[PDB]
Amino acid sequence: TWEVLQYKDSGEPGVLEVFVTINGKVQNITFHIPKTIYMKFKSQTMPLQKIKNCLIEKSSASLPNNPKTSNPAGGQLFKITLPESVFLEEKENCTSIFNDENVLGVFEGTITPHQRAIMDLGASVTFRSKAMGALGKGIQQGFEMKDLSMAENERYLSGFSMDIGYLLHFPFLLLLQSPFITKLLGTIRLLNQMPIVKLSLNEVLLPQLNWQPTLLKKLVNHVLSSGSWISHLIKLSQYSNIPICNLRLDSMDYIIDVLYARKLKKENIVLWWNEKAPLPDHGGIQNDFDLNTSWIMNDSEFPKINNSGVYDNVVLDVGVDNLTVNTILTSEFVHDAFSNDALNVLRGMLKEWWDEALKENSTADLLVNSLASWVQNPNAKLFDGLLRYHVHNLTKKALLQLVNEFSALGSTIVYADRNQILIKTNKYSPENCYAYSQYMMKAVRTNPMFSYLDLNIKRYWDLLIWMDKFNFSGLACIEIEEKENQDYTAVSQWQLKKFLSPIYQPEFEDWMMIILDSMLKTKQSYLKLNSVENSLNGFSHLFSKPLMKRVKKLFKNQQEFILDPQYEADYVIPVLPGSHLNVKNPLLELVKSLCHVMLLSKSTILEIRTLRKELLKIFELREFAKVAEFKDPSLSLVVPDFLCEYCFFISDIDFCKAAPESIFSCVRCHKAFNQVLLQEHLIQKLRSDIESYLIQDLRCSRCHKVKRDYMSAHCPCAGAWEGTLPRESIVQKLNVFKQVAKYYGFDILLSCIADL
Ligand SMILES: [Zn+2]
Ligand SMILES: [Zn+2]
């Protein structure tokens, strides 16, 4: 039994220098690893060359499923194993089996000897040599490992007793903490020969004034955290079976990659493993443009429900956590699907991880939490776009099924965002829904479809006005109590106010505070007294007469002071990111936006529309004038699926509607983001949009149909060829990016706009 500390390769192929630990102390040994390659070539027969001293054998391994490669043809996959030195030798000559005619692909040329040994042997490698006593012969030369190998149990890797050191930069098992590992390793060649545990905290920043205290504070924690670092490293390593020095702490996708790869190798499935490459290794077919792949990697938008209105019943605000893991755990013709066998392997892995995590296991809990992050990361190895598409498509179905399940009992969906769900209840008072909420939660959890979902009620709503997530108001209570009248807080988040003149913004809020009070009073009166929700009929009668007089007075003052240069500070229309409307009369916008909020009732249409006409009579405008219609003042630019590294939260960020302090900070935890990452994601969105416009399909203006010719003038129908994506849409999309890049300081995106 050997405790390998740091597997390390060198210039010579199939050579692994190992800083192993023998019962005495640390020592250096070397391993020899042959190269195993997967050949798909020809349709039948075999080369019969015999020139190479290798081992070939016809195999039946389960290949991946690239959408382009769909033809079955025949099966003659091979399992050629051949040492890497003579493989480099064979690279030289022109004639050889690996480079000849009728070669479909090489499937595992990317995996290095280091990875092969760390996946096959592991941390606890032992010697089962026996035969002749070549232990001395094995130690003087390089011990060839292919013939003799065994992996002993690693339940207890080490009882630690050893010296630890530091080496840090702020631009013996030493710990390397530097922004540039490669530069420091190359500059001091002697640093290579010593074993190092490489933990990298990067991007040191300074306030540029009085930086000595902050340098001292940044040094103190790194000095004092040594006991924690080694302890956590050993805690991960004892379960991981990866050697301590190869493993890193922040690296979490590597554990998933090794475990999934070795449990796949337990089966006959091919790895498709690819190293420092964002795309899978499919044998070389992955280096060509394909329409299906381009569509499946450009579909990251999630559906949503935004049923708007004013609700006089109670509304529940539940938060659905563990959606993706629940989706995975629960569950020829198709050319765009992931292999079912690997899917079942992943399902079994997640099930066993969850079961061990239930029994007080920290590492299993970490793996379960980090699986969702691993799925969407291309930089993680074994990453497949088909897997991401499969997971997203099943999650999309799961959310609709959950909404339908909620629809089984008397309730109505209002909103759905993968993290928040709003439910309309039949009951009228929040104090009478304690039992029904619990019953619904138990019923939802009882279903086998949603056994692993986490649901928690965040707020109870008494009166809610809903337009979208960025524009709402009402009265809410955090949690209902006993024998005490429930405390209610009034919330009002209106982005619509930001596009108003400074003199009218206070008026907007003041009049909304009267609308809400009147609606609450009339609802209480209707409840006390006993097609239309009669709780809210007649609320406008209380505040109509004051509103008319106030509007008249405001109009008179505007007529008096609009041309006064002294009052030029007022009556200035702000410029905001996503603003497109060019509008003239400031008080008209206030009255329109105030009436639009009342209009979302669906039960008091006539009453509100009479008041709207009467108010519009103060101005010289008619009830159906085009200038008197409400449009949303703001555009939208939504970047989907941004990761919080310290929170493990999936959030969709919209750069136009969302107010600041939210663009650059996570929601669950108030941790700031990194700006250049946001700029790079915006650039990715822009270039992807341009590509999607450039690869669109054509259609007939009358026969809505797809063009099936490469050279034609028009439809067999007398018509014309038009585009599925019109130019005006992409022009507007390029327009909004320019404003977003100028309101906030994004130099990289501004440069990208000007290089077009
Ligand atoms: Zn967070
Ligand atoms: Zn036609």
Going from the Cα of 692 to the center of ligand 2, the distance in angstroms, rounded, reads 25
Annotation: binding site: 644, 647, 666, 669, 700, 703, 715, 717
SS3 86: helix
Which residues touch 180 (CB under 8 Å, ≥6 apart)?
Answer: 169
Residue 297: how many CA atoms within 13 Å on its side-chain side? Answer: 18
Annotation: binding site for Zn(2+): 644, 647, 666, 669
Going from the Cα of 417 to the center of ligand 1, the distance in angstroms, rounded, reads 17
Q: For residues 548 and 614, is the Cβ–Cβ distance under 8 A?
A: yes
Compute CA 188 distance to the chain's CA centroid, rounded to the nearest angstrom: 40
Spatial separation of the C-alpha atoms in residues 142 and 128, rounded to whole Å: 16
Spatial separation of the C-alpha atoms in residues 70 and 500, rounded to whole Å: 58
Among residues 197, 201, 182, which one has the least CA distance to residue 243? 197
Q: DSSP state, 714?
A: S
Phi, psi of 309 (to 5 degrees): 155, -170
Annotation: binding site for [4Fe-4S] cluster: 700, 703, 715, 717
Q: For residues 108 and 82, is the Cβ–Cβ distance under 8 A?
A: no
Which tokens belong to 319?
């938060």
Q: For residues 97 and 49, is the Cβ–Cβ distance under 8 A?
A: yes
Which tokens belong to 313?
């019943």
Paired strand residues for 477: 460
Q: Order the strands of the 196-198 sheet from edge to edge.
A: 164-165, 173-176, 196-198
Going from the Cα of 632 to the center of ligand 2, the distance in angstroms, rounded, reads 36
Spatial separation of the C-alpha atoms in residues 100 and 87, rounded to whole Å: 15
Spatial separation of the C-alpha atoms in residues 228 and 235, rounded to whole Å: 10
Which residues touch 231 (CB under 8 Å, ≥6 apart)?
Answer: none
Residue with tokens 């493989």: 87
Buried b (16+ CB within 10 A) or exposed e, 332-369: eeeeeebbeebbebbeebbeebbebbeeeeebbebbbe
Q: For residues 402 and 448, is the Cβ–Cβ distance under 8 A?
A: no
Which tokens belong to 179?
């922004």
Going from the Cα of 717 to the center of ligand 2, the distance in angstroms, rounded, reads 4
Parallel/antiparallel/unpaired status of strands 196-198 and 173-176: parallel
What proportions of the chain, in percent to the nearest 5, are helix, strand and coil?
40, 15, 45
Spatial separation of the C-alpha atoms in residues 395 and 326, rounded to whole Å: 9
Going from the Cα of 706 to the center of ligand 2, the distance in angstroms, rounded, reads 10
The number of the ligand nearest the C-alpha atom of 666 reads 1
SS3 313: coil
Q: For residues 474 and 460, is the Cβ–Cβ distance under 8 A?
A: no
Phi, psi of 244 (to 5 degrees): -65, -45
Which tokens belong to 252?
């979490």
Spatial separation of the C-alpha atoms in residues 358 and 111, rounded to whole Å: 35
C-alpha angle 41-44-50 in degrees, rounded to nearest 5: 70
Q: For residues 646 and 634, is the Cβ–Cβ distance under 8 A?
A: no
Going from the Cα of 693 to the center of ligand 2, the distance in angstroms, rounded, reads 23
Q: For residues 636 and 577, is the Cβ–Cβ distance under 8 A?
A: no
Q: Which residues have beta carbons under 5 A from ligand 2 (an ion)? A: 700, 702-703, 715, 717, 719
Going from the Cα of 299 to the center of ligand 2, the distance in angstroms, rounded, reads 30
What is 663-723 written as a DSSP string? TTB-SSS--B--HHHHHHHHHHHHHHHHHHHHT--EEESSS--B---SS-SS-SSS--EEE
Among residues 237, 235, 33, which one has the least CA distance to residue 123? 237
Going from the Cα of 377 to the center of ligand 2, the distance in angstroms, rounded, reads 44
Spatial separation of the C-alpha atoms in residues 190 and 11, rounded to whole Å: 17
Using CA atoms, how far residue 405 sits from 289, 409, 447, 450, in Å, is 41, 8, 9, 10
Q: For residues 377 and 391, is the Cβ–Cβ distance under 8 A?
A: no
N- to C-terminal Cα separation, the chain: 62
Spatial separation of the C-alpha atoms in residues 662 and 673, rounded to whole Å: 10
Helix or strand holding residue 603 (H, E): none
Which tokens belong to 509?
């809020």
Residues in the chain: 756
What is 114-158 written as a DSSP string? HHHHHHHT-SEEE----SS-THHHHHHS-EE-SSS-EE---SS--
Compute CA 547 distance to the chain's CA centroid, rounded to the nearest angstrom: 47
Which tokens belong to 640?
């989907």
Which residues touch 115 (CB under 8 Å, ≥6 apart)?
Answer: 273, 275
Residue with tokens 């960025």: 470
Q: Which amino acid is at 105?
A: G
Which residues touch 491 (CB under 8 Å, ≥6 apart)?
Answer: 472, 473, 474, 475, 476
Which residues touch 27 (CB under 8 Å, ≥6 apart)?
Answer: 19, 20, 21
Among residues 641, 667, 666, 637, which one has the least CA distance to residue 652? 641
Q: Which amino acid is at 745?
A: G
Going from the Cα of 608 to the center of ligand 1, the distance in angstroms, rounded, reads 43
Using CA atoms, how far residue 548 sits from 128, 522, 612, 619, in Å, is 95, 21, 10, 12
Going from the Cα of 666 to the center of ligand 1, the distance in angstroms, rounded, reads 5
Compute CA 267 distance to the chain's CA centroid, rounded to the nearest angstrom: 30
Going from the Cα of 699 to the center of ligand 2, the distance in angstroms, rounded, reads 9
Q: For residues 199 and 176, is the Cβ–Cβ distance under 8 A?
A: yes
Going from the Cα of 705 to the center of ligand 2, the distance in angstroms, rounded, reads 8
If phi over 0 gives left and psi between -120 and 50 gives alpha, with beta otherwise, what is residue 382? Answer: left
The number of the ligand nearest the C-alpha atom of 670 reads 1
Spatial separation of the C-alpha atoms in residues 452 and 327, rounded to whole Å: 9
Residue with tokens 């009579």: 617
Among residues 332, 285, 273, which one has the least CA distance to residue 104? 285
Spatial separation of the C-alpha atoms in residues 108 and 96, rounded to whole Å: 18
The number of the ligand nearest the C-alpha atom of 650 reads 1
Number of H helices, E strands in the chain: 20, 25
Resolution (A): 3.3
Going from the Cα of 674 to the center of ligand 1, the distance in angstroms, rounded, reads 13
The number of the ligand nearest the C-alpha atom of 651 reads 1
Which tokens belong to 510?
């003041």
Q: Which amino acid is at 504?
A: Y
Which tokens belong to 650?
């999936």
Q: DSSP state, 511?
A: H
What is 219-287 written as a DSSP string? HHHHHHTHHHHHHHHHHHHHHH-S-TTT--SS--HHHHHHHHHHHHHTTT------SS-SS--SSSGGG
Which tokens belong to 450?
């949603």
Spatial separation of the C-alpha atoms in residues 376 and 370, rounded to whole Å: 11
Which tokens belong to 677?
């990452």
The number of the ligand nearest the C-alpha atom of 706 reads 2
The number of the ligand nearest the C-alpha atom of 700 reads 2
Among residues 321, 466, 665, which one has the least CA distance to residue 476? 466
Parallel/antiparallel/unpaired status of strands 143-144 and 26-32: parallel
Q: For residues 177 and 222, is the Cβ–Cβ distance under 8 A?
A: yes
Which residues touch 210 (CB under 8 Å, ≥6 apart)?
Answer: none
Q: What is the four-CA torsion angle of 643, 645, 646, 647, rounded to 10 degrees?
A: 20
Spatial separation of the C-alpha atoms in residues 705 and 698, rounded to whole Å: 8
Which tokens belong to 714?
């028009």
Paired strand residues for 642: 651
Which tokens belong to 402?
């959950």
Which tokens belong to 23?
């019962």
Q: For residues 245 and 19, is the Cβ–Cβ distance under 8 A?
A: yes
Spatial separation of the C-alpha atoms in residues 176 and 178, rounded to whole Å: 6
* Long-range contacts of residues 331-335, Cβ cutoff 8 Å, at least 24 apart: 331/394, 335/65, 335/67, 335/70, 335/292
Paired strand residues for 422: 317, 415
SS3 3: strand
Q: For residues 249 and 233, is the Cβ–Cβ distance under 8 A?
A: yes
Paired strand residues for 176: 198
Which residues touch 267 (CB under 8 Å, ≥6 apart)?
Answer: 62, 341, 345
Which tokens belong to 543?
């505040």
Spatial separation of the C-alpha atoms in residues 376 and 383, rounded to whole Å: 8
Going from the Cα of 716 to the center of ligand 2, the distance in angstroms, rounded, reads 6
Parallel/antiparallel/unpaired status of strands 471-477 and 15-21: unpaired
Question: CB count, 10 Å around CB of 157?
Answer: 19
Paired strand residues for 55: 81
Using CA atoms, how far residue 148 sits from 7, 31, 125, 129, in Å, is 18, 11, 11, 6
Residues preceding discontinuities in the chain at C–N > 2.5 Å?
Answer: 171, 331, 530
What is 7-73 written as a DSSP string? EEE-SSTTEEEEEEE-SSSEEEEEEE--EE--EEE-SSS------S--B--B--------SS-----
Q: Which amino acid is at 667?
A: V
Question: CB count, 10 Å around CB of 597?
Answer: 21
Spatial separation of the C-alpha atoms in residues 636 and 577, rounded to whole Å: 9
Q: For residues 167 and 174, is the Cβ–Cβ distance under 8 A?
A: yes
Residue 105: how many CA atoms within 13 Å on its side-chain side? Answer: 16
If phi over 0 gives left and psi between -120 and 50 gives alpha, with beta otherwise, what is residue 708? Answer: alpha
Spatial separation of the C-alpha atoms in residues 11 and 411, rounded to whole Å: 68
SS3 653: strand
Which tokens belong to 166?
């530091």
Q: Which amino acid is at 716?
A: P
For the packed helices 323-330 and 340-358, what is the interaxial angle rounded to 10 degrees? 120
